[PDB]
């Protein structure tokens, strides 16, 4: 069982017999959400030395993240009011960016590799695009489903397999991230499990047994890239989707 690293264990506990209060209780998932919140709080509270203008070396990091997500959501929705949807496009980044660096620490735990939470967050953003689009643009919201000047005898086919791609968008956006984080962690644990039993046979294998160690180091080098790039790709697709929902093509 190489997948035991994702087990959810209850720690602080709470129960009753009147009402099902077992929904909220401090758990491994919940404790790592508390840790994510305290890290994100720590990146801005004690980072700023006594509210100085000059912005010490720690604040350049949270300066660059801010600027690379402003200049990304200005180039996507880019209309009359792009900044009204900027806090959500930033707080969808920082959760995924911090929750995929915390998960790299060896005896730790991936928030992002729970499909039930990430798929739920994706369905929340998809319904919050459809409701916002219907509210802002009435019955002509469905004009999104015809591409451009197209010949009329093939328009209903191009409507059906446009709407099918419109509600595949509900689960695709989440399952991309879930699949990347889950496959990366499962790859690292399985190769560690193979190189461990590689190094317990006869003593000639601990000699020149440095090359599988170097391969695992190279995969860990790759895994930060595949963890930060997904945190960026989430925040670019849910900027493009707000471009479609707010502005009709």
């Amino acid at each position: 069982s190489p997948l035991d690293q994702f087990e959810i264990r209850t720690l602080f506990g709470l129960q009753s017999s009147f009402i099902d209060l077992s929904c909220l209780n401090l758990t491994t998932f919940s404790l790592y959400t508390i840790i994510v919140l305290l890290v994100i709080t720590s990146l801005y509270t004690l980072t700023n030395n006594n509210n100085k203008i000059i912005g010490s070396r720690w604040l350049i990091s949270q300066e660059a993240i801010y600027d690379t997500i402003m200049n990304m959501t200005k180039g996507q929705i880019g209309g009359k009011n792009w900044g009204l949807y900027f806090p959500m496009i930033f707080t969808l980044f920082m959760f995924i960016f911090i929750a995929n660096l915390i998960s790299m620490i060896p005896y730790s735990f991936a928030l992002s590799a729970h499909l039930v939470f990430i798929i739920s967050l994706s369905i929340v953003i998809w319904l919050g695009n459809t409701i916002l689009g219907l509210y802002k643009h009435g019955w002509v919201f469905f004009s999104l489903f015809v591409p451009a000047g197209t010949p009329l005898p093939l328009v209903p086919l191009l409507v059906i397999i446009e709407t099918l791609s419109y509600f595949a968008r509900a689960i695709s956006l989440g399952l991309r991230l879930g699949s990347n984080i889950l496959a990366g962690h499962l790859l690292m644990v399985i190769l560690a499990g193979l190189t461990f039993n590689f190094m317990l046979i006869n003593l000639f294998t601990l000699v020149f047994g440095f090359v599988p160690l170097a391969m695992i180091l190279a995969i860990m080098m790759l895994e930060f890239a595949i963890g930060i790039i997904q945190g960026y790709v989430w925040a670019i697709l849910t900027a493009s989707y707000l471009k479609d929902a707010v502005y009709l093509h």
């Binding site: 019955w139 002509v140 469905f142 004009s143 489903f145 009329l152 328009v155 409507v159 059906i160």
Partner: peptide, 24 residues
Amino acid sequence: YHFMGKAIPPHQLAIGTLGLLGLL
């Protein structure tokens, strides 16, 4: 901005196909 049978130019046509496949 289509023109079906020289009638009034239809709105976007997208709702009617969904309504046809809805009742099935």
